[PDB]
Write a protein that binds this ligand. Structure first.
Ligand code: HEA
Ligand code: HEA
Ligand SMILES: CCCCCCCCCCC(=O)OC[C@H](COP(=O)(O)OC[C@H](O)COP(=O)(O)OC[C@@H](COC(=O)CC)OC(=O)CCC)OC(=O)CCCCCCCC
Ligand SMILES: CCCCCCCCCCCCCCCC(=O)OC[C@H](COP(=O)([O-])OCC[N+](C)(C)C)OC(=O)CCCCCCCCCCCCCCC
Ligand SMILES: CCCCCCCCCCCCCCCC(=O)OC[C@H](COP(=O)([O-])OCC[N+](C)(C)C)OC(=O)CCCCCCCCCCCCCCC
Ligand SMILES: CCCCCCCCCCCCCCCCCCCC(=O)O[C@H](COC(=O)CCCCCCCCCCCCCC)COP(=O)(O)OCCN
Ligand SMILES: CCCCCCCCCCCCCCCCCCCC(=O)O[C@H](COC(=O)CCCCCCCCCCCCCC)COP(=O)(O)OCCN
Ligand SMILES: CCCCCCCCCCCCCCCCCCCC(=O)O[C@H](COC(=O)CCCCCCCCCCCCCC)COP(=O)(O)OCCN
Ligand SMILES: CCCCCCCCCCCCCCCCCCCC(=O)O[C@H](COC(=O)CCCCCCCCCCCCCC)COP(=O)(O)OCCN
Ligand SMILES: CCCCCCCCCCCCCCCCCCCC(=O)O[C@H](COC(=O)CCCCCCCCCCCCCC)COP(=O)(O)OCCN
Ligand code: CUA
Ligand SMILES: [Cu+2]
Lengths: 53, 38, 99, 530, 268, 55, 51, 236, 78
């Protein structure tokens, strides 16, 4: 005997925040492995235009 | 003791399968470019 | 509202069941809540099936109890607790019947 | 029969025309996408006319002759009499002119192409492009009249729905307790009323500037063509919030029927559904960010059309709350209503990216817009039209539709139209302009990817004709064998099979308690509720 | 008893027989719109098919209306709710026809609120001379303020029960409106600027142009409100064909006063 | 005056309501004459309007 | 349709009891609706030189 | 610049006005992948894990403690994301201190620039059209419908200020590598101010429809150096 | 070094639509040549302005509407 309660409440908080943690591992790669990768090239080439003096 | 190992096993092959959906639902142009660059 | 007001309300409604319909429509919403029902109210869910002379609505109690138990460890301790009133009425379970 | 004033038999004529105008509205989009298969004019020989004619010939059959007469006419003239508790509509004699001007709205449009010029003006019929010095013949003369016949049918087709809901209910049906499909159209009827007379002046003034030379819009005379860009688009953004609010009514019934559960926050779903309709009025120049508005006027709209994403988030997260606990019965209306919840919302994220004035200046008239508005038209207003037909087809016709064959029509629509409209975001982020028969050679990449898919979706539509053939011929021999699904609500876990046939339909609406098909007088006594 | 109750209708709302004038008006709206776009581009030679299209349409309205008065006074499913159905179906309708003026008021605030370059820097521009509000346009406001004081002087008079004020009070209101057609015929015959007079010539014969195109149907609405009250059709406890005429004119005081303040007072 | 008189004729007439007026026989056959011409002659000029033959 | 709420009698079709098979009159309504732009691509090309 | 076959991103940023768009298109889509990451997850935990739930929890309707949470949640990202969207609007009308004025007028099938600033010693404007080269006159190696015959030269590191209008049908003026897009209204005119920061040719397109010849109107523009531009201006 | 020179901000017309900037500088130049003529150097700041930011067909138009007296703007200050 045990007054077990909260099977859906433990499957909403576990359910929401593991989508926010799944909304980060697709977005923090998109802003670092793609966006900062794209700003790496434009910071490089514009530094190879200021070299010409 | 219940929701520490039974809530896990329902969810370990789920995210192993859920990412396989988005790599086909959204990642499918990463194959037609790969197959025929010509 | 609470666990105890859940128990006292549905163990009361099983008494004025009087029919097969008002067992299954009340066994339904005694299982379709967020929480898990106590064995005090499910004892009147087998006595309600004995008052209406229908056995598979007493075998479907222990199958609705099996899916909505959320742990097998919390089921065998829950099964052995009900074995005092499950051997009088002779209610089998679906796995022992092998239908 | 032809001129019977029964509201049931008018809505079956509405639906008989919205597929005929559908198989014409998508045969034009077949030739449009066939021409974008390769650089150089392939099938059209060298003609850049009859491509701005076919684009306007296709985009107005889809908006005004498919999604308008089905979600408002084909369903609203069948369900709003039935679910509320009326016997038929409140004005049943003008209920017949609201259909029979629509084939006359077709003869005013198919003959607008067969004449010598061809209206190559685009769907947004702009004034100096459509002026008489530019377009000379009677082609655009009829294309601004077929848009007027539909403007006048769907105007009195919404006066028919404000004095049906407000007085012609049953006994206990108070104003807070209605089906959400009625609150879809009754909210829509307060947008059809308050945006179509704005349009009817914005077209007749263009008629006056073409054969009566009054110069409302003529540049020689000070008449702006930029007045048109805020007067047509004052109709235009409420118009695209009218193709989606009855789309928000069908989904709220399907997703809470095939899940055995009432909808989450019903009172929260009716206040965030007029707030879409009310605040949709106050945002109408987000289409025209680049046309030279002020630096604070664009600063207002870049904050004001993002607030349309406030009540739409309520109307989506509650559809992700009304199926969390409950069961899921994956039949065909549940498949459409669960892929509507993924492809319409991805057409919403592209909405708030376009919504900014600081970012529309690199996206206007590109193909990134056409990637955005097709995720919310062919995936938000066809995904709720297929989920409304399949949800009420055997209840209304009386015959079941070969459920094993309607699942393959869903997937060929899902993945066979996502292959078209997903690479459009890539051609537009480079900057391919719209309405062009040919393009630079670097845009031949995805335009062959999006060309292989228009044969996939229009092969599913050829299959959907056969489902309509299997439903009318031996559609009675479907529910006596194992072809279809009969009961859309399977019984509960502790509900015995022999007691289910006594209490079969546990609906929350009158629409299923009626017979299949419903009677010619399905209400000859005032029904009572609670 | 119940035997007569099984011989009658059990719901107050009206059921109509299948009439064919639904597809008659639809065929007229085809031959209106198709034929008005042909004679602008030839293919006929003469401009009388539009005159035909204004004749077959308007006789189709009265044959529609002859069946309605056959239901209004000769068959009669007009209960309290059905009386409230049309009385709200028309009060919500004129919200649409007061918003079409906002499709024409807003053009006047598009060429005068911000001055343009093709015209002058003043509104009304040079070469264009406007009529002051201290002239015959001020007769047009007082003749409707006198109309707004005689449409309610005969509104309650029909309910009052005497026919000396109810019948004669609507003939004096009908000729108060035909005389309003002729004073808006002076500025259509004596004013300097025309319909093709640029943007001031465009919107001035549009905002006041559509206000002239409603008196042809309002006087035609009095043309049956006097014929029916002489042929004893209308009653003093149930009148829909008389009530829609008063709300056609009691809102007309509001829109003409908003039309007079910006076209003439603010328009000089 | 004729409101009770027509009410005997309109109620229990067993006719279509647009044939239920006593002054309605002459209202239709000239009306069906102008209806039989106004829906063909705007459409018969359409093959004349396809070949450029205008007036 | 005024009366006879049967099974096939709320539709203005004639499904059963037709003299000709129904697939003639059903595909012949939806393929005719499919072949109307293919005559707008005919009389506007042949008029404008192309074929 | 030049579009790339099978590409999926912006053209290369050659303007700080264009460079601001790329840091706002990625600032927005970072907050769009959390929302797409939520919906794609919260729809797979329901179709898979709850299609095998035969007992429907049909007594959870209101939810007052989660009703108020997801109505401030679109009111907490939008209040954040608008502050990089307000800083781009009020800092892209910087026409304070310009250095050059060039024109661009489109007559429905071409453009017509004029360099009416009279820094050139001849004291006359240099007007020249911009026709696309047809396929019959196509020199082998030219980009089809993207390469005109008479191009346009602009200096680098200079505060230019366009004026864009037309005398006929509306059609806009779009170079995606510089972030310039204005309507060319017939009755009025519009300006943009785009400092170019690298030498190279940019190709663009005309976006808004004009008529039959909408595909036959490119906007070719190359950036040269300021002495190298002046050697072109003293010639023509 | 920096030989280029053009019209500055013109804060009374700070928006994107600079059409009244093209119109009024045509006005303020031709109102200067008839009234209060003592020099040309503060009078050519309105000449050097409207040569910029104005099309050539418009200046051909504004010099043709001025010639028949059909100039819609006030051209004669005197
Ligand atoms: C209701 C709106 C609607 C719908 C559904 C569609 C559907 C489609 N549209 Fe269209 N389209 C527009 C509205 C719509 N379109 C508009 C407004 C424009 C812009 C014009 C302009 O501004 O220039 C446009 C433009 C447009 C372009 C040109 C882009 C540009 O120049 O701007 C292209 C080309 O790819 C295109 C293709 C398609 C395709 C392949 C479909 C496919 O989805 C169609 C095939 C899929 C189906 C099989 C489903 C539909 C079929 C039915 C019959 C409906 C089913 C309903 C019932 C039978 C119950 N559309
Ligand atoms: C038919 C349906 C439809 C719908 C519903 C919408 C909805 C929206 N549309 Fe779209 N739109 C069109 C159809 C539609 N649109 C058409 C046909 C065009 C013009 C094409 C043409 O001219 O030819 C157009 C054009 C158009 C433009 C003009 C671009 C251009 O021409 O330059 C813009 C830009 O502002 C825009 C934005 C939006 C926005 C912000 C919404 C928003 O309502 C959507 C918001 C929804 C959500 C965001 C998703 C759900 C919510 C959440 C999960 C929670 C909240 C979200 C977050 C916090 C990020 N639309
Ligand atoms: C303008 C309007 C044009 C309209 C044209 C559209 C044409 C679409 C036609 C679709 C169709 O009719 O299919 C339905 C038909 C009946 O199915 P049912 O629902 O009664 O259940 C059957 C049972 O449950 C399982 O059937 P079973 O498994 O026993 O048969 C195997 C079947 C499955 O394979 C396929 O579906 C693809 C080949 O394979 C074959 O039969 C191959 C025989 C050559 O199933 C079939 O037998 C299809 C046979 C192939 C037909 C040609 C396919 C072309 C793509
Ligand atoms: C997801 C649902 C199904 C998606 C179907 C996508 C179809 C892709 C397609 O048709 O691509 C064709 C390309 C073209 O290749 P190309 O580089 O243009 O070569 C020229 C070929 N022409 C154009 C002359 C004929 O050729 C290819 O790249 C052929 C590769 C086939 C890829 C199959 C699908 C990709 C994986 C999806 C999972
Ligand atoms: C659908 C079918 C079509 C429905 C709309 C039709 C209405 C337009 C009809 C216009 C017919 C016409 O030729 O009107 C000309 C009139 C007369 O203008 P005028 O006689 O030149 O006035 C100048 C006075 N002088 C200088 C002569 C002394 O000029 C006017 O004053 C025009 C008056 C009408 C204004 C109409 C406004 C339209 C708004 C939208 C309506 C949509 C419904
Ligand atoms: C849907 C989820 C995103 C991934 C779906 C599959 C496509 C993405 C992987 C394939 C791919 O090339 O995309 C990479 C980035 O995508 C992304 O970063 C998508 C973010 C998620 C870029 O790949 P790359 O490094 O080759 O970039 C080439 C630069 N020229
Ligand atoms: C604009 C059209 C009129 C808008 C208001 C119509 C709704 C209020 C008037 C009304 O109730 O009568 C209608 C007939 O009018 C009509 O049907 C006449 C409108 C169509 C001809 C317009 C001619 C303009 C000159 C309904 O007719 P009902 O028979 O269904 O009402 C059965 C009544 N118990
Ligand atoms: C302008 C476009 C107008 C569009 C439709 C406007 C309709 C407004 C009135 C709606 C009719 C309401 C109604 O049913 O009243 C019945 C007749 O009214 C009527 O028959 C009103 C007729 C209006 C005619 C004016 C329109 C065109 C006139 C001809 C061309 C000039 C009389 O019912 P009741 O209350 O008398 O029943 C008492 C029996 N005891
Ligand atoms: C919300 C959803 C709205 C739709 C958003 C549309 C896309 C938004 C921009 C993100 C694009 C990221 C692509 C990165 C990239 O450069 O990969 C390309 C290749 O990827 C590929 O060819 C496969 C593309 C897979 C992209 C899937 C994108 C899913 C959205 C999030 C990621 C590079 O190719 P290249 O252009 O360098 O090739 C040159 C040949 N000479
Ligand atoms: C955001 C994106 C959402 C996407 C869709 C998700 C749908 C979720 C629906 C979940 C059911 C809604 C609901 O009301 O659940 C309540 C609790 O959940 C909740 O409270 C949800 C969690 C809210 C966020 C966490 C709040 C802090 C909790 C701290 C835990 C660590 C149960 O209500 P009940 O059964 O308790 O009511 C009994 C009173 N006697
Ligand atoms: Cu000029 Cu498109
Ligand atoms: Cu919009």
């Amino acid at each position: 005997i045990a007054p077990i309660t909260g099977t859906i409440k433990r499957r909403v908080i576990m359910d929401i925040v593991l989508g926010f943690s799944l909304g980060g591992v697709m977005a923090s790669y998109w802003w670092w492995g793609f966006h900062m990768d794209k700003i790496n090239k434009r910071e490089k080439f514009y530094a190879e235009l200021a070299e010409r003096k | 003791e219940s929701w520490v190992i039974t809530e896990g096993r329902r969810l370990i092959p789920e995210i192993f399968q859920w990412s396989a959906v988005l790599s086909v639902c959204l990642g499918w142009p990463g194959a037609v470019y790969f197959f025929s660059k010509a | 509202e609470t666990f105890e007001e859940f128990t006292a309300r549905y163990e009361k409604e099983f008494d004025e069941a009087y029919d097969l319909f008002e067992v299954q429509r009340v066994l339904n919403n005694c299982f379709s809540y967020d929480l898990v029902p106590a064995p005090a109210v499910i004892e009147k869910a087998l006595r309600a099936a004995r008052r209406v002379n229908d056995l598979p609505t007493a075998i479907r109690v222990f199958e609705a109890l099996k899916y909505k138990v959320e742990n097998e460890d919390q089921y065998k301790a829950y099964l052995d607790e009900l074995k005092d009133v499950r051997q009088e009425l002779g209610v089998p379970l679906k796995e022992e019947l092998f239908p | 029969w032809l001129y019977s004033t029964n509201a049931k038999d008018i809505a079956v004529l509405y639906f008989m025309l919205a597929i005929f105008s559908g198989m014409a509205g998508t045969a034009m989009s077949l030739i449009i996408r066939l021409e974008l298969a390769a650089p150089g004019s392939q099938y059209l020989h060298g003609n850049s006319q009859l491509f701005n004619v076919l684009v306007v010939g296709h985009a107005v059959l889809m908006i005004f002759f498919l999604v308008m007469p089905a979600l408002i006419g084909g369903f609203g003239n069948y369900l709003l009499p039935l679910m509320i508790g009326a016997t038929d509509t409140a004005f049943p004699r003008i209920n017949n002119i609201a259909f029979w001007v629509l084939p006359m709205g077709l003869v005013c449009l198919v003959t607008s192409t067969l004449v010598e010029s061809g209206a190559g003006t685009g769907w947004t019929v702009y004034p100096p492009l459509s002026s008489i010095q530019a377009h000379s013949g009677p082609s655009v003369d009829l294309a601004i009249f077929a848009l007027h016949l539909t403007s006048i049918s769907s105007l009195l087709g919404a006066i028919n729905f404000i004095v049906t809901t407000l007085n012609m209910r049953t006994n206990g049906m108070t104003m807070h307790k209605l089906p959400l499909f009625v609150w879809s159209i009754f909210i829509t009827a307060f947008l059809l009323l308050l945006s179509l007379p704005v349009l009817s002046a914005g077209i007749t003034m263009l008629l006056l500037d073409r054969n009566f030379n009054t110069s409302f819009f003529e540049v020689s005379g000070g008449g702006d063509p930029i007045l048109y860009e805020h007067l047509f688009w004052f109709f235009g953004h409420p118009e695209v919030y009218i193709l989606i609010i009855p789309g928000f009514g069908i989904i709220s019934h399907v997703v809470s029927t095939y899940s055995k559960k009432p909808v989450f926050g019903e009172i929260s779903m009716v206040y965030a559904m007029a707030s879409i309709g009310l605040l949709g009025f106050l945002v109408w120049s987000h289409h025209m960010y680049i046309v030279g508005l002020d630096a604070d006027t664009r600063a207002y709209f870049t904050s004001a059309t993002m607030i349309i994403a406030i009540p739409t988030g309520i109307k989506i997260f509650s559809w992700l709350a009304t199926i969390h606990g409950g069961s899921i019965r994956l039949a065909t209306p549940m498949l459409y209503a669960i892929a509507f919840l993924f492809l319409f919302t991805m057409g919403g994220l592209t909405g708030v990216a376009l919504a900014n004035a600081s970012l529309d200046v690199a996206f206007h008239d590109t193909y990134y817009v056409v990637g955005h508005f097709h995720y919310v038209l062919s995936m938000g207003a066809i995904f709720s039209l297929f989920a409304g037909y399949y949800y009420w087809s055997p209840q209304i016709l009386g015959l079941n539709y070969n459920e094993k064959l309607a699942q393959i029509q869903f997937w060929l629509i899902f993945i066979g139209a996502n292959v078209i409209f997903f690479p459009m975001h890539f051609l537009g982020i480079n900057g391919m302009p719209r309405r062009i028969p040919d393009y630079p050679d670097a845009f031949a990449g995805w335009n062959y990817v999006a060309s292989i898919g228009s044969f996939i979706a229009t092969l599913s539509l050829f299959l959907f004709i056969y489902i309509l053939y299997d439903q009318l011929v031996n559609g009675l021999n479907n529910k006596v064998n194992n072809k279809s699904v009969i009961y859309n609500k399977a019984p509960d876990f502790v509900e015995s099979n022999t007691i289910f046939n006594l209490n079969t339909v546990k609906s929350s609406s009158i629409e299923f308690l009626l017979t299949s098909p419903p009677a010619v007088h399905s209400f000859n006594t005032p029904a009572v509720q609670s | 008893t119940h035997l007569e109750r099984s011989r009658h209708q059990q719901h107050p709302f009206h059921m109509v027989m299948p009439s064919p004038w639904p597809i008659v008006v639809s065929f007229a709206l085809l031959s209106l719109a198709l034929s008005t776009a042909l004679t602008m581009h030839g293919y006929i030679g003469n401009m009388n098919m539009v005159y035909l299209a204004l004749f077959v349409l308007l006789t189709s309205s009265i044959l529609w209306f002859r069946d309605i008065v056959a239901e209004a006074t000769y068959l009669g499913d007009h209960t309290m709710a059905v009386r409230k159905g049309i009385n709200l179906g028309f009060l919500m309708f004129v919200l649409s026809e007061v918003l079409i003026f906002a499709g024409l008021f807003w053009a006047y605030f598009h060429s005068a609120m911000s001055p343009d370059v093709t015209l002058g820097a003043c509104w009304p521009p040079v070469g264009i001379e406007a009529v002051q509000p201290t002239e015959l346009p001020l007769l047009n406001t007082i003749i409707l303020l006198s109309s707004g004081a005689t449409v309610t002087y005969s509104h309650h008079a029909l309910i009052a029960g005497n026919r000396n004020k109810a019948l004669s009070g609507l003939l004096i209101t009908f000729w108060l409106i035909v005389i309003f057609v002729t004073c808006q015929y002076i500025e259509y015959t004596n004013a300097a600027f025309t319909i093709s007079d640029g943007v001031y010539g465009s919107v001035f014969y549009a905002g006041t142009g559509l206000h002239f195109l409603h008196m042809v149907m309002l006087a035609a609405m009095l043309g049956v409100n006097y014929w029916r009250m002489r042929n004893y059709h209308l009653t003093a406890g149930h009148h829909v064909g008389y009530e829609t005429t008063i709300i056609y004119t009691h809102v007309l005081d509001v829109i003409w006063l908003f039309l007079y303040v910006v076209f003439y007072w603010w328009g000089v | 005056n004729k409101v009770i008189q027509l009410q005997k004729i309109f109620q229990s007439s067993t006719k279509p309501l647009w044939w239920r007026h006593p002054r309605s026989a002459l209202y239709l056959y000239p009306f069906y004459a102008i209806f039989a011409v106004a829906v063909v002659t705007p459409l018969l000029y359409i093959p004349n309007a396809i070949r450029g033959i205008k007036a | 349709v005024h009366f006879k709420d049967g099974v096939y009698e709320n539709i203005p079709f004639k499904v059963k009891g037709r003299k000709t098979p129904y697939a003639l009159s059903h595909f012949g309504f939806f393929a005719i609706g499919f072949a109307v732009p293919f005559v707008a691509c005919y009389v506007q090309l042949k008029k404008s030189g192309a074929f | 610049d030049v579009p790339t076959p099978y590409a999926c991103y912006f053209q290369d940023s050659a303007t700080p006005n264009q460079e601001g768009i790329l840091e706002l298109h990625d600032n927005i889509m970072f907050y769009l992948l959390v929302i797409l990451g939520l919906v794609s997850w919260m729809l797979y935990t329901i179709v898979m894990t709850y299609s095998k739930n035969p007992i429907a929890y049909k007594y959870i309707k209101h939810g007052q403690t989660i009703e108020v949470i997801w109505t401030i949640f679109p009111a907490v990202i939008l209040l954040i994301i608008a502050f990089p969207s307000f800083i781009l609007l009020y800092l892209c009308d910087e026409v304070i201190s310009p250095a050059m004025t060039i024109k661009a007028i489109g007559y429905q099938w071409y453009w017509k620039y004029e360099y009416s600033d009279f820094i050139n010693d001849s004291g006359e404007t240099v007007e020249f059209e911009s026709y696309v080269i047809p396929d019959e006159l196509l020199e082998e190696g030219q980009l089809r419908l993207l390469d005109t015959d008479t191009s346009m030269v602009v200096p680098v590191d200079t505060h230019i200020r366009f004026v864009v209008t037309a005398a006929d049908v509306i059609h806009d003026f779009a170079i995606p590598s510089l972030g310039i897009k204005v309507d060319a209204t017939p009755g009025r005119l519009n300006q943009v101010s785009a400092l170019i920061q690298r030498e190279g040719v940019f190709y663009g397109a005309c976006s808004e429809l004009c008529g039959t010849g909408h595909a036959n109107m490119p906007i070719k523009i190359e950036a040269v150096s300021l002495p190298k531009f002046l050697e072109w201006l003293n010639e023509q | 070094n920096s030989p280029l020179h053009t019209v500055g901000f013109d804060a009374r017309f700070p928006q994107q639509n600079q059409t009244k900037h093209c119109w009024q500088s045509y006005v303020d130049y031709h109102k200067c040549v008839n009234m209060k003529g003592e020099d040309f150097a503060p009078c050519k700041v309105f000449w050097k302005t409207y040569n910029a930011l104005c099309p050539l067909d418009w200046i051909e138009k504004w010099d043709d509407q001025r010639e028949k007296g059909i100039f819609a703007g006030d051209i004669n200050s005197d």
